[PDB]
Enzyme design. Structure first.
Site, PDB file in Angstrom:
ATOM      1  CE  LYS A 109      -2.413  -0.951   3.721  1.00 51.66           C
ATOM      2  NZ  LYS A 109      -1.485  -2.061   4.049  1.00 51.66           N
ATOM      3  CG  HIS A 220      -2.473   4.518   8.570  1.00 45.65           C
ATOM      4  ND1 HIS A 220      -2.196   4.521   7.219  1.00 45.65           N
ATOM      5  CD2 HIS A 220      -2.240   3.253   8.999  1.00 45.65           C
ATOM      6  CE1 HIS A 220      -1.819   3.311   6.849  1.00 45.65           C
ATOM      7  NE2 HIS A 220      -1.837   2.522   7.909  1.00 45.65           N
ATOM      8  CG  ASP A 385     -46.680   8.082  32.447  1.00 46.06           C
ATOM      9  OD1 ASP A 385     -45.593   8.556  32.864  1.00 46.06           O
ATOM     10  OD2 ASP A 385     -46.758   7.038  31.760  1.00 46.06           O
ATOM     11  CG  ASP A 387     -51.533   8.313  31.226  1.00 49.01           C
ATOM     12  OD1 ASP A 387     -51.336   7.456  32.109  1.00 49.01           O
ATOM     13  OD2 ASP A 387     -50.822   8.393  30.205  1.00 49.01           O
ATOM     14  CB  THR A 476     -51.021  -4.923  37.064  1.00 50.21           C
ATOM     15  OG1 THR A 476     -51.452  -6.291  37.004  1.00 50.21           O
ATOM     16  CG2 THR A 476     -49.501  -4.862  37.045  1.00 50.21           C
ATOM     17  CG  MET A 477     -55.564  -5.145  35.273  1.00 58.20           C
ATOM     18  SD  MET A 477     -56.436  -4.483  33.857  1.00 58.20           S
ATOM     19  CE  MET A 477     -57.951  -5.418  33.947  1.00 58.20           C
TER      20      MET A 477
HETATM   21  C1  LIG Z   1     -61.178  -0.517  29.788  1.00 60.51           C
HETATM   22  C2  LIG Z   1     -62.604  -0.409  29.241  1.00 60.51           C
HETATM   23  C3  LIG Z   1     -63.287  -1.778  29.200  1.00 60.51           C
HETATM   24  C4  LIG Z   1     -64.726  -1.673  28.688  1.00 60.51           C
HETATM   25  C5  LIG Z   1     -65.446  -3.022  28.777  1.00 60.51           C
HETATM   26  C6  LIG Z   1     -66.895  -2.966  28.287  1.00 60.51           C
HETATM   27  C7  LIG Z   1     -67.566  -4.342  28.359  1.00 60.51           C
HETATM   28  C8  LIG Z   1     -67.780  -4.806  29.802  1.00 60.51           C
HETATM   29  C9  LIG Z   1     -68.049  -6.309  29.940  1.00 60.51           C
HETATM   30  C10 LIG Z   1     -69.447  -6.775  29.519  1.00 60.51           C
HETATM   31  C11 LIG Z   1     -69.709  -8.182  30.068  1.00 60.51           C
HETATM   32  C12 LIG Z   1     -71.103  -8.727  29.743  1.00 60.51           C
HETATM   33  C13 LIG Z   1     -71.450  -9.965  30.579  1.00 60.51           C
HETATM   34  C14 LIG Z   1     -72.842 -10.503  30.224  1.00 60.51           C
HETATM   35  C15 LIG Z   1     -73.600 -11.082  31.419  1.00 60.51           C
HETATM   36  C16 LIG Z   1     -73.525 -12.606  31.587  1.00 60.51           C
HETATM   37  O1  LIG Z   1     -72.575 -13.250  31.139  1.00 60.51           O
HETATM   38  O2  LIG Z   1     -74.546 -13.234  32.229  1.00 60.51           O
HETATM   39  C17 LIG Z   1     -74.322 -14.647  32.397  1.00 60.51           C
HETATM   40  C18 LIG Z   1     -73.718 -14.923  33.769  1.00 60.51           C
HETATM   41  C19 LIG Z   1     -74.615 -15.865  34.589  1.00 60.51           C
HETATM   42  O3  LIG Z   1     -76.008 -15.514  34.551  1.00 60.51           O
HETATM   43  P1  LIG Z   1     -76.650 -14.307  35.416  1.00 60.51           P
HETATM   44  O4  LIG Z   1     -75.747 -12.998  35.141  1.00 60.51           O
HETATM   45  O5  LIG Z   1     -78.080 -14.030  34.720  1.00 60.51           O
HETATM   46  O6  LIG Z   1     -76.802 -14.609  36.859  1.00 60.51           O
HETATM   47  O7  LIG Z   1     -73.392 -13.681  34.423  1.00 60.51           O
HETATM   48  C20 LIG Z   1     -72.414 -13.837  35.360  1.00 60.51           C
HETATM   49  O8  LIG Z   1     -71.937 -14.943  35.606  1.00 60.51           O
HETATM   50  C21 LIG Z   1     -71.945 -12.595  36.128  1.00 60.51           C
HETATM   51  C22 LIG Z   1     -70.453 -12.350  35.898  1.00 60.51           C
HETATM   52  C23 LIG Z   1     -70.184 -10.932  35.387  1.00 60.51           C
HETATM   53  C24 LIG Z   1     -68.692 -10.669  35.169  1.00 60.51           C
HETATM   54  C25 LIG Z   1     -68.467  -9.273  34.586  1.00 60.51           C
HETATM   55  C26 LIG Z   1     -66.992  -9.009  34.276  1.00 60.51           C
HETATM   56  C27 LIG Z   1     -66.892  -7.743  33.423  1.00 60.51           C
HETATM   57  C28 LIG Z   1     -65.477  -7.476  32.907  1.00 60.51           C
HETATM   58  C29 LIG Z   1     -64.619  -6.714  33.918  1.00 60.51           C
HETATM   59  C30 LIG Z   1     -63.429  -6.079  33.195  1.00 60.51           C
HETATM   60  C31 LIG Z   1     -62.837  -4.932  34.017  1.00 60.51           C
HETATM   61  C32 LIG Z   1     -61.848  -4.106  33.191  1.00 60.51           C
HETATM   62  C33 LIG Z   1     -61.404  -2.854  33.951  1.00 60.51           C
END
Ligand SMILES: CCCCCCCCCCCCCCCC(=O)OC[C@H](COP(=O)(O)O)OC(=O)CCCCCCCCCCCCC
Ligand SMILES: CCCCCCCCCCCCCCCC(=O)OC[C@H](COP(=O)(O)O)OC(=O)CCCCCCCCCCCCC
Lengths: 542, 542
Positions: A109, A220, A385, A387, A476-477
């Site tokens: 070189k 170099h 944050d 929010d 957390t949740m």
């Molecule tokens: C971050 C935003 C999230 C927005 C989510 C919107 C949607 C919410 C969830 C809708 C759930 C609909 C459930 C329908 C009802 C049902 O399944 O009925 C049957 C069963 C037994 O019969 P019975 O109700 O006539 O006695 O119902 C159950 O077993 C009751 C359990 C309900 C559990 C609800 C949990 C909701 C989700 C929570 C998420 C939280 C997120 C922060």
């Protein structure tokens, strides 16, 4: 000041050699026994019937030149210290060690130290009866006003041609002839954003121009020919291409070598490769050599472009396979093909349907979260944050809106969940949106398999945990959700129990709260609390 | 602030992809038509009968992952922006684009962004009927207290194993099983001297600890596990080897991958390779992968060491050839063989002999140069280092001594010149010594061929010019020597003419003297003057 991986400074070059051998793909390299001050690497394929092609010079340009020792290329390489020419003694030793009656061609070189040392060596060799020839390579085009063009990356293209003929038994005179012919058809231009780090304490960091680029910086670290007022890949490459075109014949095919001086990122090297492919030099390229680190300047953050004219035997010789640690197989610049695929609309289909029960739940869940916006932000503001409340509210209102516009498939949970799962991330930014979408998407699918709601909700949780990586106790949740989903799994209709469980879990997050450098309710995780309030609302409606 | 080669920031990743394809060795890569925000590269060897192995993540780790797409490895790679995860949409698009009934395995490095995005993608894919599995790789061992080990270089070893089985038609379940098995047997540890340069304006230069090294710095520049108080290659590598050994089984063969994070010089990488070969880890190594830039962090000046246990199918799968742009063929660490050569004593042989004529010349030439020491230093001090007089005096006295000790082969010029040529560089440091040795060595040899003195002296000059690179007018002794040797070539015995010629040439060097920011005799080149005085002395003795 030294930013360099090494052990004993005096053993630096020797250690590099050992490492090169240890990694030899062909295991065709061997050190030559000698005084510690002589550092010669030679091939084990020693066939003195053919002409020997010796090279070398100061170190710090690895893989050059040891990486180009082997069948089809270099016979041996004489390694000096970092950026320092090998001794006359060393060069001679190599000549005598691998040169037979056929003679040897020294490829040097363009640098005084090498020219003078390999030169006195050739002279001492000639007195000993060896047939020797020397070819000084000066391929750099950065300094037109320079009487002695520096020898850089292109040098190895010269090794390639010389090697072709030497291996095939041609005579010294022919090797030299062809080697010189290749040299005369080789043009290189380099550019760097910063010089290299030396294996020693220095006065100042590596030369660097902010936002600019030094065109022609030497291997170099020598001063370049100019400074470009930008680092823009396209501008820099086109400027380089112009100068290359001005030195190249106005017509003829070309092989171009994209060399990484040592510090450019592979990503950057790819971009550079793209620029070259789009440069006016494009229509004459039949082969690309690299991008690769072939002739370096330690970790210098720059690259070089070498163009060699494909006339006569050049191309034939370039394309021949050789056996070295680092020769790169030339490749025709490929065109960028664009493939088309057949993808079904991800968008979930559904038809609005009523169901007073479900609607009541959706409305309730939806409202509770919406109402908690500012409170959840307050809790999140403590360490997060601030929010989370808004993020969750964003999703709640999105589903509330759809509900209020009679747009939800309320009569089919599976599709309903799938719909929520699809819509949340669109309205909820960040990991919260993704996690919730994961939850409902997986839940909606568990229902599609005909599982009951609680089972589906638990699968949603399970998937949220797998991807999210969180566990009970990580604040957390999940800390409130799992307890609740487990409670319901045993007592499917006991909403009070579910809430109580969630509530305990939310409370646990107030304890393990690190951020706190009385009631500790201000250390509650928003996710958990939001969850606990949802179930609380559900339980209070029964 | 930005020290990065690129054009449009928003087109950065896309440009990298284009470059990767343009340089594809197998030409088996193709971009996938899509929205500009989706950057997917797929193989043209699409065989949906086999299980698809998809990977990807943020960019800036090139050649990963596009460089491991092909037969025997990755089916496609989803490229996010620099150090940013790809979108959920993007990942899905890849799944639908290359996945058949056989299903696909997503290989994800342990990072939230990727886990969440590839995760929601897998979920949306499953709802569409595709069979999907995800393997999160967390091979980093730098942070024992970390719940989620980061995924780094070792990840590609996982691609290798997954690819082996997928190409050979094994089912998804099997691919995943084996892939997980490989992961569980992969351990990596990285170290860096400085973080990487980002393609943007920043607040401060890349993190760097003077004289020290950050152990465990992440591939995104994340904080490491500790700081080593040295950069010493041996200490650093052994420390790393210890931690690797503490995580590896106490017995079993190993394959070790030496990865360059992007900014380490090839020389350094070789030294590192040597250290590894001499580490306690040595006796269990059967294969080396690298040193090479395989999974980078842009131009991060650090390297990583990955050890994979060779149990079961692992080794078989590692050694299988594949078709990708950057998979490196594993190589057994070679031992460093030392070759011996047969070299004749360079030392020139001779026998002291007398010759009053020659001795008179040698004495005269010798004295003249010696006497001029201080004057020649004065002239050299003007622009040079002011030592030329001493350097020349050093050589003169060495030959004078030999003369005075009746040690010169005075009766045989050829051998005499050869002897001087051999002795000058030993006593004369720097280029002056080498040039003079070249001169006499070549001269002595021209005489050996039976040429007259003037002819031999001219050959000496010719050789001095070839290696030295100087020409008449460049202000060196040549400016006086050539004229003199030419004068003598026409008038072999006219010493007065020779001197006059040399004198004119020396005088010419006073004119072209740049350094001068009356008689100008202080701008005379020492070499030329010394030469002119020698001939002057010769002419005055006749
Ligand atoms: C971050 C935003 C999230 C927005 C989510 C919107 C949607 C919410 C969830 C809708 C759930 C609909 C459930 C329908 C009802 C049902 O399944 O009925 C049957 C069963 C037994 O019969 P019975 O109700 O006539 O006695 O119902 C159950 O077993 C009751 C359990 C309900 C559990 C609800 C949990 C909701 C989700 C929570 C998420 C939280 C997120 C922060
Ligand atoms: C600053 C470095 C200057 C180097 C100058 C070298 C000067 C060589 C002087 C030779 C005088 C010119 C020859 C005249 C023609 C001639 O034939 O003279 C007769 C005789 C035999 O010649 P023939 O065999 O062709 O018939 O020539 C000689 O005897 C030549 C004697 C050479 C003595 C060389 C002493 C070298 C001292 C080197 C010191 C180096 C210090 C750096």
């Amino acid at each position: 000041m030294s930013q360099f991986f090494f052990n004993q400074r005096t053993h630096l070059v020797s250690d590099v050699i050992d490492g090169a051998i240890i990694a030899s793909p062909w295991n065709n390299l061997a050190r030559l026994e000698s005084d510690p001050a002589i550092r010669i690497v030679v091939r084990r394929d020693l066939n003195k019937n053919n002409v020997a092609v010796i090279s070398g010079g100061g170190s710090g340009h690895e893989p050059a030149h040891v990486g180009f020792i082997g069948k089809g290329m270099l016979t041996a390489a004489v390694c000096g210290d970092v950026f320092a020419s090998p001794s006359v003694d060393a060069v001679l030793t190599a000549i005598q060690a691998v040169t037979g009656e056929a003679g040897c061609l020294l490829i040097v070189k363009n640098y005084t130290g090498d020219r003078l040392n390999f030169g006195l060596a050739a002279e001492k060799a000639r007195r000993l009866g060896y047939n020797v020839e020397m070819l000084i390579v000066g391929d750099d085009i950065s300094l037109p006003d320079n009487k002695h063009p520096r020898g850089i990356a292109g040098t190895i293209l010269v090794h390639k041609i010389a090697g072709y003929f030497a291996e095939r038994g041609y005579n010294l005179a022919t090797v030299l002839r062809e080697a010189q012919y290749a040299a005369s058809n080789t043009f290189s231009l380099g550019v760097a954003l910063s010089s290299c780090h030396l294996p020693q304490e220095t006065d100042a960091a590596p030369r660097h121009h902010p936002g600019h680029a030094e065109l022609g910086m030497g291997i170099h670290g020598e001063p370049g020919a100019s400074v470009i007022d930008t680092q823009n890949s396209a501008q820099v490459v086109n400027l380089m291409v112009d100068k290359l075109l001005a030195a190249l014949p106005e017509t003829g095919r070309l092989a171009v070598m994209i060399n990484n001086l040592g510090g450019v990122s592979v990503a950057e090297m790819a971009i550079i490769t793209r620029e070259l492919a789009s440069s006016p030099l494009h229509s004459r390229i039949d082969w690309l050599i690299g991008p690769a680190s072939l002739v370096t300047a330690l970790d210098m953050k720059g690259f070089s472009l070498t163009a060699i004219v494909l006339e006569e035997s050049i191309e034939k010789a370039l394309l021949t396979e050789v056996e070295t640690s680092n020769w790169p197989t030339p490749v025709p610049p490929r065109e960028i093909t664009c493939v088309v695929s057949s993808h079904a609309s991800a968008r979930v289909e559904f038809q609005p349907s009523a169901n007073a029960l479900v609607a009541g739940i959706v409305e309730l869940v939806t409202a509770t979260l919406s109402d908690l916006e500012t409170h959840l932000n307050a809790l999140d503001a403590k360490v997060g944050d601030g929010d989370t409340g808004s993020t969750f509210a964003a999703a709640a209102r999105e589903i509330a809106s759809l509900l209020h516009r009679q747009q939800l498939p309320l009569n089919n949970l599976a599709t309903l969940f799938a719909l929520i799962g699809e819509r949340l991330t669109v309205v909820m930014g960040g990991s919260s949106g993704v996690l919730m979408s994961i939850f409902f998407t997986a839940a909606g699918q568990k229902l599609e398999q005909g599982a009951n709601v609680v089972e589906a909700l638990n699968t949603g949780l399970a998937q949220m945990k797998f991807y999210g990586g969180a566990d009970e106790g990580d604040r957390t949740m999940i800390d409130a959700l799992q307890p609740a989903l487990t409670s319901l799994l045993a007592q499917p209709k006991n909403l009070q129990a579910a809430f109580d469980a969630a509530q305990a879990g939310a409370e646990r997050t107030c304890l393990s709260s690190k951020a706190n450098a009385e009631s500790l309710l201000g250390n509650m995780d928003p996710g958990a609390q939001r969850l606990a309030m949802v179930f609380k609302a559900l339980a209070e409606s029964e």
